[PDB]
Subunit: 256 residues, 6 copies
């Protein structure tokens, strides 16, 4: 198995003892994803990508974080929705920090954090920084971390056109949209019900945020753009593009 | 469709809670060494498995489990010096339980059952519960009720303890990665258990105190505290039904319709 | 008749807030390197200047700004390895924003506009707001409204973008110490600028991921991410009026009497 | 070009630290009520002004000041019940001081002077310094030196006290918004002072203890603890030279050039 | 020169003992908690301190000022934190206290600490304080600081002694709050703070295999005790005291041998 | 007994039940006090005064805080002396806050915090503020706290004249001096060995603080003044003044009803 959770400590110890062990940590969230998808999408997707990348480069995947930072309106609908279960920033940062500290104790020195929830970013970054600060106090400076969001690897203009033949608008309105739905169709068809999609126009917000969040500024279904044009085929395209891009990036950052 | 909150859309979840009788379950585990014969997510798999079967019988829902738990103690987990074991600081675990309870309250939920499969998590789960309730109280909510239990506590009946432990019983004290857990795994996840690797050693014994930093020489090299050589899928099935039934009834009594 | 709270008497401030409908504005910047050609308090100066002008037009008051912001990230500020750059830990920035909101609420204020001038601050400002609003609810206050915004998010009109970037626009991705900020500075604080020191280097290109510890070699030696050789006072005047008007109308719509 | 780090480019700042004996100064103030006659940023303006002058005179640099400080105490600042006064929790002020020292240490700086302008700040500035120095030790750094001082502690000359308080000096325990601060403000920021609005009331008196919640009746209505009627620009310039001079020498003593 | 209590020593006396190189320090960790109608509320501080004092005299150790406030009371372990008098700290507060103290003893040059807990619920937070402190010490280059944490009652294991304490059969520390065990030790150590006449004789408390929150006052005896101390005696107390003192004294010699 | 720890919860409940019960809490420290005194002086003195004041006005005394904030050179010698065991500020604040929260839960509403360690003050104050903030969130606003350092009641020139016949240099250098040593001779003479006093010249400091602490600026013995002229008689004088003033103040702030 490529999952650390499915290994005995002896199998894990042996892999780390090899000296060139690369670990991957998916970081997601429990969040509403419209009427058509389940709420663990942000955990499922990064974990899936990690698995496939891990199989191709010989890496191991740590148990993913199921709860992430609070959902923001302009990018995820808003934390006012039912089901969405968010952690405070300090809690997420502390979790990332504790994990990096423990991996360092194991002898691991190469970590890839794969974010599946846009809003986690800064808290993952702070957690990495606080952990490296600590490792430095303990005499460790060779621990390296690569943090990335798999969607950032779908930049090829060609690829974007096959995914958005009617023109692209940006990652800003993608919550529960074509991109994530297509991936879910390919990896978890049982958890996607395209027939429930609400084909509302893309969501537009002014250049600023309001708190407490105003429900009426987010489309009723919770999506920021219609996933009507999503397909298992598009999902397969995105997946391979992400897996190959991420696998090559890892080889480049963590060379033997 | 599913009993798992993560496998539902927010609308389905919303509907289940709006019914006003919704009971939610949260498994709290750990990524910890379990000897040479079992994978390291045992403490997550078991409570989650027990939650699913209880949820199916009483109509409850199961929240995504907490994969990381408190540090492993030598006298009940072998120690935190083992590789693979990835523990959280107490504050981090406490804060996670606290944030989740707060969010569930925001959804309108008021009935929560925390089920941990990692002995050392207990006190931090309790503090997180206490801190969340205090906070809910400041918010004007005093009807949020929480039940916290470790599934193995429901295996009390002597008749069941003879079946599992013929040659005698040395309490849950020494039991990490032993008969009990290994049996359940054999029944629930036979592919994640290789009993052929079990290192059969005599029951670990410690003095009536703890030492820090942990001295590696005071815990069997395998990481186990007792041999799981007599574990069996049959013992597993027994343990499983006993727990599912007991916990299911306990919940019905604490959260009557 | 200043718009700055710090320049007022507590009785003058009190009358303003007790008058009702009082809008407070808090600039949130940072002490960060901005190349060879600009001073390091740019992120405090710019948003403060915008606040002053907006407050003068709509009748709002401006709180003293937060001088220190969150750590600088390579893909938008060059990195926190540069000298001079003095960054706070996330929890520190978040707690500062939280404390201030709590106090304004005690004053009786209920309308706050947070104007960010440092890209990396956003999420910590957001958490501060959320933690504060949560707290106000415990106190029985649910009518406190906050609007957070970065003054640059108001420069989107194609026509305006055309005049600022004739030879093309590569986004705000690498707009640190570039044409945008440098232009604004030339128009508001020309003495703290010196285009002759600008290093006319090509745009910065980074892979679709981040690496820690930060690799100093992946950031232009000067600290800038894009050349500001084409900055000017004229462009500064354009951006300024655009932002002031856009933000002023925005505030009127979010905070009507 | 300036003594304010905020007004320098990172290159110039780096060149100054490279010298090896650069001194940095950090003003720590507060946004707090100061009666009917003065603005509320007095505690930032004054220590900032003194830092500027001291820094220019001795060749040091001034960091951006902390605009928000610890909660106002009744017996020393009227109380945190007044509107306008915007205070931070102790942990927040402490953490801010701690983070700054950590960063300055990263630049290579090793000499810092913290000039407090708000009486109640001190202990939290101290914990911040302690926690920072503890971290530096873990990181292998033990040559970072910090001097913390409240500028008013340099006005102790009996002859100076006389010129400032003919009728007598009843201590700094009721000098909130009184003759001392108002005088300095008249010498530095006269536009932010209006003696016409001063409420000439007798010196507030307090028992040897504090009560919480703070009882509004135990503090003069206007917010001041003593009258600033006798304040003057001359006294202010007197205080200014005494402080700048005194602090300037203490710094040269504690941070001798190399 | 003066006593086994660090608080009664001058810093020079303390310094002289630590300079020895193998000085053992003991820290009592108790609580201010209700103990039924028959005993005072500082029992959890008194008992461990009393055990520490005696152990210190026999092995040559010093005793630090005890922590008076401990972690919140649990219904199934101490009646519950809803009774008046009981004054508990949050987990983070007790952990931080233990952490700060260890950090300081290390600065003194001490390297051997025994934490004697007298309140069942303190255990895990003491443990986290130890772990966090040892982590800090490590960043500071210190890896030779050793900590032994124990609850004195765990040294009362011999079946023989157990029969003499419970001639009618044991019941486990699951309901030994204010029961026979603590009351006997008090009758032997502080008779003036105990009055058996007020002891409410009721059947042992029993609880399901789980806890509920908010706590339900009804699931715990009214007096606060989980079992009766009616059969408590100054004699049983003298027996328990000696067993613990000797057991712990020998355990400490084992863990901290003289250099 | 006036000690809460020596009461039964029933007896304590009965006292708070009166509705006007005043609780007193000593806050001290474990700190070096020269060659002539033990290190728990800062706990013994305020606890002793508390005891007397409580017996006199009918109040109860809570267990004292044995550990306090870090010793400062200019008022405690420095935190570099062995024996001195100090808490971080956050830990002391949190301890005060938790106790006040618990007392509020008991129904109690009157608390006097008696400090006996100079450095604790502001952290005791933050703890009080934070706890009252919480009580407010919980709908409780009738909880009143009086905080004081017992030595602040010894102001009368006549009384000082008698204690320092040959002049007085303020509390600025009283650590382990005449004042505390005199009280100890009158209250705990067995804990004082006046024969060990190191009669050195008073300590002098500039108008500022230096960090890290330089041991060279503190008399080797750890005292800031010589206690050679301390006496049981002066101890009884000081004790009279304190108990008197404090008792009167509390009856003033917490009148019976
Ligand atoms: Cl998303
Ligand atoms: Cl286990
Ligand atoms: Cl920027
Ligand atoms: Cl002041
Ligand atoms: Cl107990
Ligand atoms: Cl003192
Ligand atoms: Mn998301
Ligand atoms: Mn476990
Ligand atoms: Mn910036
Ligand atoms: Mn002030
Ligand atoms: Mn107890
Ligand atoms: Mn002291
Ligand atoms: Zn998503
Ligand atoms: Zn397990
Ligand atoms: Zn900038
Ligand atoms: Zn002032
Ligand atoms: Zn007890
Ligand atoms: Zn003292």
């Amino acid at each position: 198995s490529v999952f650390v959770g499915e290994l005995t400590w002896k199998e894990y110890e042996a892999r780390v003892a090899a000296g060139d062990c690369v670990l991957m940590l998916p970081v997601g969230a429990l969040e509403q994803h419209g009427h058509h998808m389940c709420m663990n999408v942000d955990v499922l997707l990064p974990t899936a990508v990690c698995k496939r990348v891990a199989e191709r480069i010989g890496a191991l995947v740590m148990p993913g974080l199921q709860y992430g930072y609070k959902s923001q309106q302009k990018s995820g609908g808003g934390n006012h929705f039912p089901g969405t279960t968010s952690l405070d920033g300090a809690t997420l940062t502390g979790t990332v920090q504790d994990i990096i500290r423990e991996l360092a104790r194991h002898g691991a020195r190469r970590l890839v954090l794969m974010n599946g929830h846009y809003q986690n970013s800064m808290f993952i970054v702070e957690g990495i920084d606080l952990a490296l600060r600590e490792l430095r106090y303990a005499g460790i400076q060779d621990f390296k971390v690569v943090v990335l969001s798999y969607w950032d690897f779908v930049k090829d203009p060609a690829v974007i056109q096959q995914l958005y033949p009617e023109g692209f608008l940006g990652w800003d309105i993608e919550h529960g949209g074509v991109f994530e739905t297509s991936l879910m169709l390919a990896l978890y068809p049982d958890l996607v019900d395209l027939d429930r999609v609400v084909d509302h126009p893309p969501a537009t917000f002014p250049p600023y945020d309001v708190f407490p969040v105003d429900p009426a500024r987010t489309p009723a279904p919770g999506t920021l753009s219609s996933a009507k044009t999503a397909s298992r085929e598009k999902g397969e395209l995105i997946l391979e593009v992400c897996v190959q891009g991420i696998a090559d990036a890892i080889r480049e950052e963590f060379p033997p």
